[PDB]
Write a protein that binds this ligand. Structure first.
Ligand SMILES: Cc1cn([C@H]2C[C@H](OP(=O)(O)O)[C@@H](COP(=O)(O)O)O2)c(=O)[nH]c1=O
Ligand SMILES: [Ca+2]
Length: 129
C-alpha cells in the first residue's frame, strides 16, 4: 500500500470526511471501522474526535487497499492519516469506533485495528464503558 496526498475540505462525522483527492472533491469513508451516528451515544464525541484530528493536521494522506476503492454510494474507501497518524486506528484505540465492515481484499490493516480495539475494551473506554 502507498500513501497519497489529499487536503481537507470538510469534517463530516466520526468515519466520513470530505477531502480533495487528485484535484476532485470526494467523500471518504474510513476502511474497517464504524462510528456511531451523530444522533447516537458517543456520536458527537466521535465526530469531534475525527474533526479535531483532521482539522489540526498539517498533512492529510489517503491510502487505498487492494480491492474496491469506491463503495456503492461513490464514497472513497481508504485509510486516512493525519500527520502520519492513522485516523481509523486512533478512533478504535479510544473506543470511539468498532472494527467493522471487514471484507476480503480490503483488509491489510485488520490485525492492527483489532489489536487497538482489544486495548480500548480492556480499558473500558467510551463505547466499552
Ligand atoms: C466501510 C464500508 C462500507 N460500505 C457500505 C456498506 C453499508 O451498506 P448499507 O448502506 O447498505 O448498510 C454502508 C455502511 O456505511 P455507514 O456506516 O457509513 O452507513 O456502506 C462498503 O460497501 N464497503 C466498506 O468498506
Ligand atoms: Ca457509521
Amino acid at each position: 500500500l502507498h500513501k497519497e496526498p489529499a487536503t481537507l475540505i470538510k469534517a463530516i462525522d466520526g468515519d466520513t470526511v470530505k477531502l480533495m483527492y487528485k484535484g476532485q472533491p470526494m467523500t471518504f469513508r474510513l476502511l474497517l471501522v464504524d462510528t456511531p451516528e451523530f444522533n447516537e451515544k458517543y456520536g458527537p464525541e466521535a465526530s469531534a474526535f475525527t474533526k479535531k484530528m483532521v482539522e489540526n493536521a498539517k498533512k492529510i494522506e489517503v491510502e487505498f487497499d487492494k480491492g474496491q476503492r469506491t463503495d456503492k454510494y461513490g464514497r472513497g474507501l481508504a485509510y486516512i492519516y493525519a500527520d502520519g497518524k492513522m485516523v481509523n486506528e486512533a478512533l478504535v484505540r479510544q473506543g470511539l469506533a468498532k472494527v467493522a465492515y471487514v471484507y476480503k481484499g480490503d483488509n491489510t490493516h485488520e490485525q492492527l485495528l483489532r489489536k487497538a480495539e482489544a486495548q480500548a475494551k480492556k480499558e473500558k473506554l467510551n463505547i466499552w464503558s
